[PDB]
Amino acid sequence: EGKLVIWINGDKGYNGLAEVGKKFEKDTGIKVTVEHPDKLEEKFPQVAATGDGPDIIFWAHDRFGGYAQSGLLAEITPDKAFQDKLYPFTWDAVRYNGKLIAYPIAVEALSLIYNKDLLPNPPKTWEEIPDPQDPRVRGLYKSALMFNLQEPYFTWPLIAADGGYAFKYENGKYDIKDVGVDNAGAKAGLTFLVDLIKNKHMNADTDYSIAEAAFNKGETAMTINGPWAWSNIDTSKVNYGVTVLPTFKGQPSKPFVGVLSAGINAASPNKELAKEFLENYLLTDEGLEAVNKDKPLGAVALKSYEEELAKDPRIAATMENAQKGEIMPNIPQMSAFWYAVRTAVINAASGRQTVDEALKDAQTRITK
Ligand SMILES: OC[C@H]1O[C@H](O[C@H]2[C@H](O)[C@@H](O)[C@H](O)O[C@@H]2CO)[C@H](O)[C@@H](O)[C@@H]1O
């Protein structure tokens, strides 16, 4: 009691938060502890399931419906005046069973970050990446594209591009049995990713870390990452641009828009202290700008603050791609989807399964 323990993934600005935390204490004389586990997404459900853990917790809203259905998260109640400070859509994202289960922090979406000093003009097509059709670049391709291949969230826009989909959205409801993970669209997208690899263009063991170091050092021209990545690049002295993602089979790459939400542990007896921290401190200009400077938020859910930095060009592009992708469901079976697809991508890329056997397997694990 009298001490907030907040969790926030490692790629987010945990140091920005902690600082805001100090601002709390310098006023309320309360200790806020910004920890940031590894796999906090999966630990949380397990630690709070036993009345233990973090007071407050951060994660892209797709994981909240689950926490909710199990009841590890307190129903939040800000007044309608506060609610209006935030764009409507973001509140919709933290809505489960007609009950707000989190505070919206910011909207994020992947983009194509390219090295302006190697590629003054980044491709407009995935199909150009392996075969560029321009002798000016051939002498350049260094690796052309490197991004994390371990998390399915990175491969999704490609798979989605020509028609893949998680759970079918039927105006207000998602038919949780109409899974579009194994179908031409998904097959076509994954097959391409496999060629990129089997055609020496990409390496199956690329994870966030490798791709980041690589693009940052300058040993690859292009990468795909969220707003959080921009920070290290700025302190890597790399000349980069953030643009719309390449189109696959003519259609655009549809990212999966995620809303960084900060919930409250039901098992926590510090709820009135969370509300004030999140409401009067973080969810403000000065507060969000604090977290933000550590590592960029994307389009912050706070209106006033979203507009000021709305003029930032990468925020503009982050919104362009977000605009083409679909915002992700917060239903409980999302977690089943990610685990099922991660595995699917891995075996596909790794060579352990055919594109079809791999995808039909994931599908089935989801519909089972
Ligand atoms: O890849 C599946 C996971 O993707 C999303 O997670 C993203 C997360 O939203 C993003 O902000 C983060 O920074 O990268 C991860 C994946 O590396 C979903 O939020 C996760 O819960 C999924 O499991």
Side-chain angles (χ1 to χ4, degrees), residues 7-12 40-42 44 57-68 73 90 93-95 101-109 151 153 227-228 256-263 297 326-331 334-335 338:
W7 287 2
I8 175 153
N9 195 45
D11 46 22
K12 267 60 181 202
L40 72 69
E41 86 268 18
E42 259 140 58
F44 177 82
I57 156 170
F58 289 58
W59 200 269
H61 82 281
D62 58 320
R63 291 292 188 180
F64 289 40
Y67 299 1
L73 302 170
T90 68
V94 295
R95 202 185 289 299
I101 60 193
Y103 287 103
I105 310 292
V107 185
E108 57 204 22
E151 289 301 79
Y153 170 82
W228 56 95
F256 227 156
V257 172
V259 183
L260 170 78
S261 310
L297 293 159
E326 285 68 71
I327 178 179
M328 62 194 156
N330 69 1
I331 54 177
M334 263 314 273
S335 60
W338 294 128

Side-chain angles (χ1 to χ4, degrees), residues 68-185:
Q69 192 123 274
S70 294
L72 340 189
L73 302 170
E75 159 208 50
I76 244 80
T77 62
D79 71 5
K80 337 303 290 288
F82 174 80
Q83 297 194 32
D84 268 26
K85 293 181 164 173
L86 276 53
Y87 293 115
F89 86 99
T90 68
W91 278 119
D92 273 357
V94 295
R95 202 185 289 299
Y96 195 56
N97 213 82
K99 193 169 298 87
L100 289 181
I101 60 193
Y103 287 103
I105 310 292
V107 185
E108 57 204 22
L110 299 164
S111 307
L112 178 83
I113 327 213
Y114 60 107
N115 189 336
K116 276 186 150 184
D117 300 1
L118 296 174
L119 234 38
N121 288 275
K124 289 158 181 55
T125 29
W126 268 98
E127 298 112 323
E128 267 189 45
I129 292 158
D131 188 267
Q133 294 309 51
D134 176 351
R136 281 176 293 171
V137 294
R138 301 177 326 163
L140 172 101
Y141 297 164
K142 302 181 195 78
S143 36
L145 174 47
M146 273 195 97
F147 65 102
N148 174 16
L149 273 198
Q150 310 319 333
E151 289 301 79
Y153 170 82
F154 284 90
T155 297
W156 198 246
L158 209 209
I159 289 188
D162 204 43
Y165 67 77
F167 307 95
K168 176 72 163 54
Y169 193 38
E170 204 62 88
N171 41 260
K173 300 161 285 57
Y174 283 101
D175 183 0
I176 67 170
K177 250 162 62 70
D178 187 20
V179 181
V181 168
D182 90 302
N183 78 59

Side-chain angles (χ1 to χ4, degrees), residues 190-191 194 344 347-349 351-361:
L190 200 58
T191 295
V194 162
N347 297 7
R352 292 184 277 278
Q353 270 171 316
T354 70
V355 271
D356 296 17
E357 78 193 28
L359 285 176
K360 210 300 168 301
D361 280 38

